[PDB]
């Protein structure tokens with residue numbers, strides 16, 4: 001059975017655009033990271049009370065996430081069709097997808113060598129313990145690491161990666177969207193591109209139900225999104241927390 005239509009010229013163009021958009025918005029040398037407020041790692045081999053007292057890693061990780069949100073805004077703007085949406089719908093989609101696209105794009109620095117996000121020397125190597133020093137708990141972090149491993153092991157082509165990030169952003173089932181049908185049309189064009197790509201270009205056995213595995217990752221992301229939001233709320237109750245964040249982070253997660 002399994003028909004394998006060739007990518008259309010339009011679908012090839014969509015893929016080219018998204019690759020270019022990623023290459024322009026994702027620096028794989030992490031060369032800007034020395035501009036963030038510095039990482040600080042307090043002794044915390046154990047403590048939620050101490051973590052909240054210090055939030056030693058929060059200014060660095062908030063800057064990292066803020067920077068990443070800016071990059072995702074830039075990427076989104078280059079997604080074919082995104083600019084056909086109204087401004088209110090663009091913003092709803094960005095704010096609701098931001099943490100999920102950050103999680104997806106971070107997969108590129110994530111390494112199964114030692115289950116870290118390695119963005120340079122020791123200073124810019126991020127482990128579970130660094131995320132607890134920014135005030136999050138294991139209810140978010142452990143499923144996040146499991147998600148990163150699961151995604152890594154799909155061995156996505158860059159084409160598939162950038163399409164998944166685009167599909168994540170242009171989702172019609174986000175609360176507060178107005179033109180759901182237009183968003184769904186944009187998404188379907190990207191989804192069809194991805195399905196076609198996988199069937200033409202992705203060798204076996206990694207192609208086996210790869211599309212369904214990728215859609216499952218999107219569902220997984222909704223769950224992480226909800227847990228992050230719960231935890232962010234609690235972190236936001238810590239006095240003086242706002243100075244450790246950024247204006248963009250406060251808006252997107254507030």
Ligand SMILES: C=C1CC[C@H](O)C/C1=C/C=C1\CCC[C@]2(C)[C@@H]([C@H](C)C[C@@H](F)CC(C)(C)O)CC[C@@H]12
Nearest residue numbers: 061065068102103105106108109117126131134232
């Ligand atoms: C964000 C990226 C993209 C570029 C590189 O791959 C590095 C990178 C790593 C991304 C990482 C490694 C550090 C911890 C991060 C930022 C997770 C963290 C749960 C987010 C929270 F800390 C955010 C606030 C505090 C606002 O609630 C989500 C993705 C993780």
